Design a protein around this ligand. Structure first.
Ligand SMILES: CC(C)(COP(=O)(O)OP(=O)(O)OC[C@H]1O[C@@H](n2cnc3c(N)ncnc32)[C@H](O)[C@@H]1OP(=O)(O)O)[C@@H](O)C(=O)NCCC(=O)NCCS
Ligand SMILES: CC(C)(COP(=O)(O)OP(=O)(O)OC[C@H]1O[C@@H](n2cnc3c(N)ncnc32)[C@H](O)[C@@H]1OP(=O)(O)O)[C@@H](O)C(=O)NCCC(=O)NCCS
Ligand SMILES: CC(C)(COP(=O)(O)OP(=O)(O)OC[C@H]1O[C@@H](n2cnc3c(N)ncnc32)[C@H](O)[C@@H]1OP(=O)(O)O)[C@@H](O)C(=O)NCCC(=O)NCCS
Lengths: 158, 158, 158
């Protein structure tokens, strides 16, 4: 049994994240999407909305479950009893910070493995930040996100 | 005929940008400097000042025009009837942030080409950000910017 | 004699910083830890606290001294009569955010050399920012900082 925790802010969840979750749900027995509160990013969407949006996008995947959390990731992953961290790697990705994240979480949670997947090339350039900014200026983002997300964004700036 | 759009925050426009603009004006029939409002960056200079500085620095180039805009770039490029995006490439900052911007703008403006130029090595290391912070602490920034920009920075903090 | 300045925000100082400083004290007659006020970052700890923590961690090194400053680095280095800047370099920390920093300071303080050291691999991944957030969520950070630093973070968040 592998249980994998996919942590992120998901503000909002994109077609990029969803590609990864598709792939991960076919690989693992249990996939948990851990949506972090991330109060210091001043997220456009509330935690509840983000969790809700992530659930909507993933409701067709039976072994995928979505949860919000605002505690320390190293604590939370033990608390979820996941044995694997999942992260995506696309652009760079940032690649500094991913390694800095992995080695520091490995000191705090030594029995949890850090693992990476890369999205389909066709979604490797979708940024949550820029999806938000395109929406805030009235641009079509239907090609970057799930329909429910596109709608939540439209109604967010109206 | 080619009409080229060089979008940026230009806060302020630096000798790096000016180098690029000299080179681009020499290559294309029409070059438009599109100065983005970029409110999420809290620019030191107002859009109107930034545009004014960009005009001052480029007024000697007859095929160069300066416009401010606060809409979606993918919209604006159309209303400007430009067929090419210009961006600078150097450092590089994040060589993918440019790949990521081009690629989703390729999605919003399929008919506009993304193009890159590089400034002279002698200007390859000037950061608008560090120009602002150096100026803010009373450091001499005349070596990084056009004289008119240097006056604006001096008077910006007094 | 060489006198070398190690500038940084140090919010707080880490075992990463401390390793570099250790390596620098064996190399140079005089090492100055210049803690920048850095108000644009809103530091968790005040300049005075950060200065104190750096003193505590380095007080056993007789040729190492700690100074706080809120002026321009290119100016302050002249006030300290140091001829060398020290910066750390561990994996794409900020790629050439160090080189543009170096070359822009080369314009402001031409008689001062920029020099880099890299920390022991065991400290190549410690992030001040991530230490702050782990501490804010009650995680153990003793693997990342000196005990005195570990003490100060606990009292900061209770
Ligand atoms: C795992 C974790 C630490 C990573 O946080 P994070 O990378 O900053 O946020 P995410 O994981 O959701 O992914 C970051 C996305 O948002 C961007 N981003 C990162 N920091 C950002 C910030 N302050 N503001 C806006 N956008 C940011 C990134 O560029 C990235 O992609 P994007 O360009 O498409 O927007 C996060 O899940 C978290 O905060 N967990 C719990 C709290 C915790 O344990 N902190 C200590 C970490 S060891
Ligand atoms: C070109 C464009 C699209 C991207 O903007 P941008 O590249 O981030 O801003 P710039 O063009 O000036 O280039 C990056 C500069 O902004 C600075 N910058 C980036 N984020 C910053 C921030 N939060 N705060 C302060 N400065 C910031 C960078 O420091 C960099 O300058 P520097 O490296 O010399 O320090 C911009 O003109 C724009 O946002 N246009 C319209 C809005 C839009 O369409 N957004 C959707 C994007 S697809
Ligand atoms: C030498 C100097 C410039 C270094 O600046 P700095 O590298 O950004 O700050 P630090 O030295 O503490 O090192 C970077 C640390 O702060 C982070 N950081 C860098 N820029 C940041 C920013 N805008 N906001 C928040 N954190 C930032 C880095 O990521 C790193 O933290 P980390 O451990 O989590 O990775 C410092 O002396 C300074 O900031 N100012 C001196 C006054 C001056 O002359 N400024 C103009 C410099 S040209």
């Amino acid at each position: 049994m592998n249980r994998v925790l996919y942590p992120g802010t998901f503000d909002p969840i994109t077609k990029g994240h969803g590609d990864l979750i598709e792939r991960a749900s076919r690989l693992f027995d249990h996939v948990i999407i851990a949506v972090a509160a991330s109060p210091k990013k001043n997220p456009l969407f509330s935690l509840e909305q983000r969790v809700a949006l992530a659930q909507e996008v993933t409701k067709h995947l039976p072994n995928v479950e979505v949860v919000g959390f605002s505690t320390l990731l190293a604590h939370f992953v033990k608390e979820q009893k996941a044995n694997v961290f999942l992260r995506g790697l696309r652009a760079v990705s940032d690649f500094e910070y991913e390694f800095q994240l992995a080695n520091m979480n490995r000191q705090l949670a030594p029995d949890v493995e850090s693992m990476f997947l890369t999205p389909s090339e066709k979604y490797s350039f979708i940024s949550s930040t820029l999806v938000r900014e395109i929406a805030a200026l009235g641009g079509d983002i239907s090609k970057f996100v799930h329909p429910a997300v596109a709608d939540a964004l439209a109604e967010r700036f109206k």
